[PDB]
Amino acid sequence: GLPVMNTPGSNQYLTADNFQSPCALPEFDVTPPIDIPGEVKNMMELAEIDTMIPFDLSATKKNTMEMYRVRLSDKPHTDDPILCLSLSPASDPRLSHTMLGEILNYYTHWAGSLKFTFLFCGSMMATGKLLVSYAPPGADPPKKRKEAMLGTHVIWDIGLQSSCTMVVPWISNTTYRQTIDTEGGYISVFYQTRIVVPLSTPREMDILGFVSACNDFSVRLLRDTTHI
């Protein structure tokens, strides 16, 4: 009847396509779905959940709660960072294992703003001030508190607020960061002042760190790799 011409591309299965397929149970009525609470509509809405960053990946400390706290102490008051942290959400083992990172693993380009958090979880009576600094990419992580105070940085008073939060900003020439290897910036924490305390209270506080995506974050070009 109607004259037609099959062009090239006919009879090839193309995984990456979708066309109305004939259904194998056309009579069968499907069970209606219910309003189960907690429907996810977009992967980003998981990247948006602040999760813990394994700061210590020392064979010993890893694979146990210990890989998540930072032993804020009161030992010789050195001048290096308390914990430096490169913001290559994918190019860094520390950040790689996070949830954010887990979703990033399934994509090649992603580009947004990471927001971090540092919940202090030491004595209620303990008190001090730590300097948290954002070394922007291209540069070098600061090694002295001084250098870091010159840069951007919060001066977070332990005693006043148990948690310093802070959204690092989005940047990239190539307006989509590549997950693979090589920049991204850093985040360090400096003892600004020692963590002074009243009575026998231990001189061993700890700090937890979070990370997540902000609304501006997004990913593109999916790429699963998981195999065996």
């Binding site: 591309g9 009879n11 299965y13 995984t15 790799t225 195999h227």
Partner: protein
């Protein structure tokens, strides 16, 4: 008189075989590596296309790829076989490329794939512009060239006891092109 035949499209838009991927049926006998063939899509081999592109500095273009497959038995022997079927994998930029014949990559969900059964309408797909930047570059004046993915082909029929070599011409044809900053063209000679 009219300009139509020389608009950017009318110029660039033209099917041009850019390569011939060749593979061999997994003849369990002695087939070494011809099991699969893989090619990183790059214009840089077809002087023809290459030249027309270097006439500019920047450009964007949805590339369409057709596939023409051709087989034949290697031994004049009573070569019998059932219509084979080729797998055509497109590997988008920054994705792992298959190594083994049976490397997990063929299975990996990301890679758009094609199963073309021999002797049929030529296979065809069309990746859109995939620059990470805003246009593919043709020249650079900085330090650490762009990608357009990889093609990968492998026969799927397995224990065939008759070697069946097969070429696969790829006919890439730029579509929806747009260019920037024309430059003097390079002499035919250097390529």
């Amino acid at each position: 008189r009219s300009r139509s035949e020389s608009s950017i499209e009318s110029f660039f838009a033209r099917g041009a075989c850019v390569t011939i991927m060749t593979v061999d049926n997994p003849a369990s006998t002695t087939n070494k590596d011809k099991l699969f063939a893989v090619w990183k899509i790059t214009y840089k081999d077809t002087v023809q296309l290459r030249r027309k592109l270097e006439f500019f500095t920047y450009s964007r273009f949805d590339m369409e790829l057709t596939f023409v497959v051709t087989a034949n038995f290697t031994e004049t022997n009573n070569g019998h076989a059932l219509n084979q079927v080729y797998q055509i994998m497109y590997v988008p930029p920054g994705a792992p490329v298959p190594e083994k014949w049976d490397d997990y990559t063929w299975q990996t969900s990301s890679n758009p794939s094609i199963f073309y059964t021999y002797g049929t309408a030529p296979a065809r797909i069309s990746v859109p512009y995939v620059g990470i930047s805003n246009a593919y570059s043709h020249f650079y004046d900085g330090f650490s060239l762009n990608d357009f993915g990889i093609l990968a082909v492998r026969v799927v029929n397995d224990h065939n006891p008759t070697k069946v070599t097969s070429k696969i011409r790829v006919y890439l044809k730029p579509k929806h092109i747009r260019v920037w900053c024309p430059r003097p063209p390079r002499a035919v000679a250097y390529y």
